Design a protein around this ligand. Structure first.
Ligand SMILES: *[C@@H]1O[C@H](CO[C@@H]2O[C@@H](C)[C@@H](O)[C@@H](O)[C@@H]2O)[C@@H](O[C@@H]2O[C@H](CO)[C@@H](O)[C@H](O)[C@H]2NC(C)=O)[C@H](O)[C@H]1NC(C)=O
Ligand SMILES: *[C@@H]1O[C@H](CO[C@@H]2O[C@@H](C)[C@@H](O)[C@@H](O)[C@@H]2O)[C@@H](O[C@@H]2O[C@H](CO)[C@@H](O)[C@H](O)[C@H]2NC(C)=O)[C@H](O)[C@H]1NC(C)=O
Ligand SMILES: Cc1cccc2c3c(ccc12)C1=C(C(=O)C3=O)[C@@H](C)CO1
Ligand SMILES: Cc1cccc2c3c(ccc12)C1=C(C(=O)C3=O)[C@@H](C)CO1
Ligand SMILES: *[C@@H]1O[C@H](CO)[C@@H](O)[C@H](O)[C@H]1NC(C)=O
Lengths: 532, 537
């Protein structure tokens, strides 16, 4: 028996597993229960803390994926399958994982806490691309990741109701953060040095914890990769959340009053709610998800935009960034003329129809403004430019401009902010060349996946992954990603100078402006238009 | 008596003068009466044709400048005084001018008819910069210019009234064009080949004649320099014109103890005021402090213009028409010193962000806060939002694009798509003699002297290159007048037609023609396609 793999936490005893990496071993505790199973009468309810157990929990393998939609766009294709559930689905899914150096650290080690993305409707901490073994070995941090409920199970809301208050997936995440406060020291982690990091909806989640006082006391620093709590897809108002929940109930034959509606929903098999969840959206769109965090005054006391404007962010350091081509991946899910299997050289008519798919639920006047700004009026009908332009529309509106607005406001209100654009397209990418560096494709580099010999990355890619892991861990340790002067240095982003760095195989290059002209449109003008 | 200097026109006999030009002699008939003097009871009324006379009228010097405002921004300064009246002011001003080769052409010669600009409130055919002698000598065309009423006298309108129906200054121009049809042959001119040209409000006027069927039959080609009839300053609606006329009447005491009332009585009272008294108040009836807005301009009242120029252009079939159109490099700069905060010809006008924002409201007057925010969005560099030189240039672009470039671009694109052959230019040479500061670039009005061949005047101190440049331009303009195509009937760089898709235009400067694409296409998409939709909602 190996004592390094036996840990006692508040609820009881656990047995972990020793993992190999090319750099040496790591200890892992996978599938640690942190809540009571949120099922039966507990579906839609806030998570309850896991009650203490006798005996030893086997923490040697990932637990179930929270019940969710499974993508079917391209069955068996690596680029989509890599995001799909890779363990069995269950509502019994509130488990978390801890990776630590081997042997266990005996002094307090900085903690990275990963929150997966997936539009709040999908994702799992067990995905291969989130394997924490390389970051932990290389950079000697403790890494924690949790599953949280998604889709209707995590975000269905009848606002005001006790039976389905909404935001329970964010409470699962908060409960995991509390568990980290109470137990991470037993693994060698320092609960006073916790850095949250997340991508996409995971990044939106990180932002929401920043903006919610009861979460804010549970961590110290934040990293938001390709996502922000102020993204137009990341929250829904109370009225529309009620509308969607009510429609879902109808679609699944409920009722046979909030209490009655929820009671009926609780009788339905999980897969039945999943089968209808896309259909409660108000229109056909890309980058919109039915069940997302609701602004109801509780978890979020106001919209993230308002909270961001009102906040004093002295004492916060935050690392934020985007990939080179944020919009491209979403276009194959509904923009007319798009496919991963051709060049997607669309026509002007397709472009104009695509603007309403990618900028859903705005007035005709707003759409015309989008078309004005994203048309090259010297080449209004050129298909390659139209393809790139619609990618820009979707990527700017949903990711780049919300991230830029968060970055500028936080910096202006006291935070120290570092910004990047990730510009390396992986040698192993399975999506077509036209998509460039798509959403999600920096993650495997941050997690050091190229170091895995069984995969096919180049030697240059391994060095690049090592560089990125070092920036991320430097940031978690000190609030500053920089290595000692040599360089160039990564300067802080500020509302005026707007400096960020390119992350690519080449050394850091400093640039100015996160699509400043386009983001002035989305961040400054378009809301005034929508308001009048 | 010299037979070359004697001509009989329908009204009677004329005597003209022989003018010397650096290239040789020209015949000039200056100050030919073409209407009855529009004064006393004829003030505000359409022009009446000139009654025939016995004996010989001496057409031997320019007649009076139509009564108008006189600029006082920079007293004595060449750059402003060159546009000010250079003959006595009078309401008795409806005379035109004919220049013809000496000896008179023996076969019918193409005619150019010049219409001056000046915002419909100013201008005169007598200004030195419109001297027709060089063009006639160099290119052997006949040149005609006319005075037309301006300000209140030409454009005060009480729509529906017979006593001040509006647009009478446009009717003055039209009567002159009819005179050309009836009489130009007596001077050796070909009435079947008349090309109108004009700059600024004169260019807007040309376009209004294009769009008004009774004028359209009086000429065959058109040139629009730095102006268009669809310009936002160029026309006013019936209600706003009535409001302006009524407020002007009120400011000078008409009617006594009241506002508005019976139109006959209102106008009768206005007709008793001294001309200068109307002039002293004409700027005060505008709805706000602005630049590039003028109180009394053509009114869209269903008569001269049956619909807005914008709509007439969109609806028109322009097959059979050739047009030449263009802009100078810095259309906006000249207007800024007339009211944009922080601007002066006497410093660098390096304005602050706050002055830029205030200037946007002065330069894009009478739009919603939302429309103004859209302008600020499109004209701010969000990487350099407070940089004074960029702000100075951006406000110049705002004013020039909104008032001149984008209206010309829209007219050019619509006419081309609807049948016309169109040629477009940007004029990019700053005159060696220009007296405005360097920051203003090539300002509004500063191509005219080259088109008229003014650098060929010895008493002026233009360079030899500039004389050669002037000769080139006169050649393009007269080629266009003769053939509907400015290109030379070889190994010379060719000027391609402008079309809605390719949007090709040429750069006019000392260097040879360079072909470029797009008349500020991104900016003009904003002004022409989007901003109107915004204003409607
Ligand atoms: C590029 O492909 C899209 C998507 O099409 C699918 O994938 C192709 C590789 C091929 O297998 C097609 O038959 C598939 O339909 C094409 O857009 C579609 O066009 C078809 C008609 O040809 C229409 O029935 C679908 O509804 C369209 N789908 C969408 C999402 O618009 C597009 O035409 C292709 N571009 C080309 C060929 O230039
Ligand atoms: C640039 O000049 C403008 C215009 O001012 C006039 O011209 C100057 C050259 C000088 O002769 C001034 O005395 C003239 O008033 C300046 O704008 C003005 O500022 C004064 C007070 O400083 C104010 O009373 C006027 O209203 C302003 N005029 C405007 C706003 O049109 C401007 O400040 C000058 N820029 C400098 C000096 O950097
Ligand atoms: C089934 C369905 C309907 C409408 C939109 C969908 C979408 C996805 C998957 C299934 C969808 C989908 C994305 C979308 O933007 C999207 O709109 C990406 C987040 C990848 O999976
Ligand atoms: C007296 C007065 C008030 C308001 C605006 C005026 C303006 C000019 C002259 C006098 C003005 C004036 C121009 C304007 O744009 C302008 O707004 C240019 C056309 C040159 O003369
Ligand atoms: C206006 O007053 C004059 C003054 O006599 C009169 O002749 C005219 O008919 C009046 N018109 C109207 C419409 O009242």
């Amino acid at each position: 028996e190996d004592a390094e793999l036996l840990v006692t936490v508040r609820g009881g005893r656990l047995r972990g597993i020793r993992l190999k990496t090319p750099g040496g071993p790591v200890s892992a505790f996978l599938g640690i229960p942190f809540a009571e199973p949120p099922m039966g009468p507990r579906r839609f309810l806030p998570p309850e803390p896991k009650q203490p157990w006798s005996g030893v929990v086997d923490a040697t393998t990932f637990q179930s994926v929270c019940y969710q939609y499974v993508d079917t766009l391209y069955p068996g294709f690596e680029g989509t399958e890599m995001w799909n559930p890779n363990r069995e689905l269950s509502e019994d899914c509130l488990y978390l994982n801890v990776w630590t150096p081997y042997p266990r650290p005996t002094s307090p080690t900085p903690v990275l806490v990963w929150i997966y993305g997936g539009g709040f409707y999908s994702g799992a901490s067990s995905l291969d691309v989130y394997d924490g073994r390389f970051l932990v070995q290389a950079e000697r941090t403790v890494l924690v990741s949790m599953n949280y409920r998604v889709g209707a199970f995590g975000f269905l809301a009848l606002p005001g109701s006790r039976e389905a208050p909404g935001n329970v997936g964010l409470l699962d995440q908060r409960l995991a953060l509390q568990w980290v406060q109470e137990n991470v020291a037993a693994f060698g982690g320092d609960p006073t040095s916790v850095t949250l990091f997340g991508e996409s909806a995971g990044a939106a989640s990180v932002g929401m914890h920043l903006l919610s006082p009861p979460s804010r006391g549970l961590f110290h620093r934040a990293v938001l990769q390709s996502g922000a709590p102020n993204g137009p897809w990341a929250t829904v108002g109370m009225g529309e959340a009620r509308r969607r929940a009510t429609q879902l109930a109808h679609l699944v034959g409920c009722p046979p009053n909030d209490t009655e509606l929820v009671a009926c929903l609780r009788t339905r098999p999980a897969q039945v709610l999943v089968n209808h969840e896309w259909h409660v959206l108000p229109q056909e769109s890309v980058f919109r998800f039915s069940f997302v965090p609701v602004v109801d005054g509780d978890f979020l006391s106001d919209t993230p935009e308002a909270l961001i404007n009102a906040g004093d962010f002295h004492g916060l350091q935050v690392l934020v960034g985007v990939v080179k081509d944020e919009g491209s991946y979403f276009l194959v899910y509904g923009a007319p003329g798009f496919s991963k299997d051709n060049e997607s050289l669309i026509s002007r008519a397709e472009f104009l129809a695509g603007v309403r798919v990618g900028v859903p639920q705005v007035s005709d006047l707003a759409a015309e403004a989008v078309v004005l700004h994203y048309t090259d009026w010297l080449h209004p009908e050129d298909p390659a430019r139209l393809r790139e332009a619609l990618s820009d529309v979707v990527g700017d509106h949903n990711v780049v401009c919300p991230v830029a607005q968060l970055a500028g406001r936080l910096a202006a209100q006291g935070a120290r902010v570092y910004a990047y654009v990730f510009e390396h397209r992986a040698s192993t990418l399975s999506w077509p060349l036209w998509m460039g560096v798509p959403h999600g494709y920096e993650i495997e580099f941050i997690f050091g996946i190229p170091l895995d010999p069984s995969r096919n990355y180049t030697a240059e890619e391994k060095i690049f992954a090592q560089r990125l892991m070092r920036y991320w861990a430097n940031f978690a340790r000190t609030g500053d990603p920089n290595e000692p002067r040599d360089a160039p240095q990564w300067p802080p982003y500020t509302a005026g100078a707007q400096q960020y760095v390119s992350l690519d195989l080449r050394p850091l290059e400093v640039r100015r402006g996160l699509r400043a002209q386009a983001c002035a449109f989305w961040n400054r003008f378009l809301p005034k238009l929508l308001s009048a």
